[PDB]
Amino acid sequence: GYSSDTTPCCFAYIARPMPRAHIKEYFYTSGKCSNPAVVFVTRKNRQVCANPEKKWVREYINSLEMS
Amino acid sequence: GYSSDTTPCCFAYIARPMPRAHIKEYFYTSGKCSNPAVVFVTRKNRQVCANPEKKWVREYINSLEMS
């Protein structure tokens, strides 16, 4: 018995790294989704799916976590 | 291939019918999602997953479709 609310999932990963300065937040999609995904939130508040195994993705997360 | 945007998916259905007056509109979730679903959008913009096979759910869509 879980939420009956929708939850965002990803079905494709952005191919090339987004400019780091345009990203302000990230989150991981629900473990219920078929794919693991990182979602980068841009400064124009768009949400972009990214491959959590990619090097640049892991670096961006580390950078967003540091401050 | 798909876009790298997120997509709302459903993982549980609301058991009992919600009040018809609270519903603004509906949409079906993407066939990319593993569970088929209708999403009912309330006046406060809540997105509630529902089972399209269920009688009350198809009555509500018909009501939001014919007018």
Side-chain angles (χ1 to χ4, degrees):
Chain A
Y2 220 96
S3 290
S4 51
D5 295 310
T6 56
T7 189
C9 296
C10 291
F11 294 99
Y13 301 131
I14 183 101
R16 329 275 66 114
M18 20 229 328
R20 167 68 176 94
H22 295 344
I23 298 152
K24 56 167 179 189
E25 300 167 43
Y26 86 98
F27 62 88
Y28 279 94
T29 48
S30 173
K32 296 178 212 334
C33 296
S34 61
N35 295 319
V38 166
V39 175
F40 282 125
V41 184
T42 76
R43 276 182 197 273
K44 300 180 139 85
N45 292 296
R46 232 64 259 159
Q47 298 186 77
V48 185
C49 296
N51 190 336
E53 286 181 12
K54 280 281 186 84
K55 67 290 157 183
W56 68 267
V57 176
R58 286 168 320 212
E59 295 197 291
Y60 281 24
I61 289 170
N62 296 159
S63 168
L64 290 154
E65 286 193 339
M66 69 175 276
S67 175
Chain B
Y2 319 101
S3 65
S4 60
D5 290 358
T6 60
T7 298
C9 294
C10 289
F11 294 102
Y13 304 126
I14 198 170
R16 300 273 44 96
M18 42 210 260
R20 166 69 176 87
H22 294 189
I23 295 171
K24 264 208 297 185
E25 67 245 2
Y26 82 103
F27 65 93
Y28 286 97
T29 47
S30 175
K32 293 177 292 256
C33 299
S34 289
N35 304 311
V38 189
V39 173
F40 285 121
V41 179
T42 69
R43 42 184 173 54
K44 295 191 169 74
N45 289 315
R46 189 170 105 253
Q47 301 195 334
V48 182
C49 298
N51 193 175
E53 297 173 297
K54 293 194 179 134
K55 213 246 251 178
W56 76 262
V57 173
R58 309 171 277 190
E59 307 192 315
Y60 276 26
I61 291 154
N62 301 356
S63 151
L64 294 144
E65 253 274 315
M66 72 173 276
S67 323

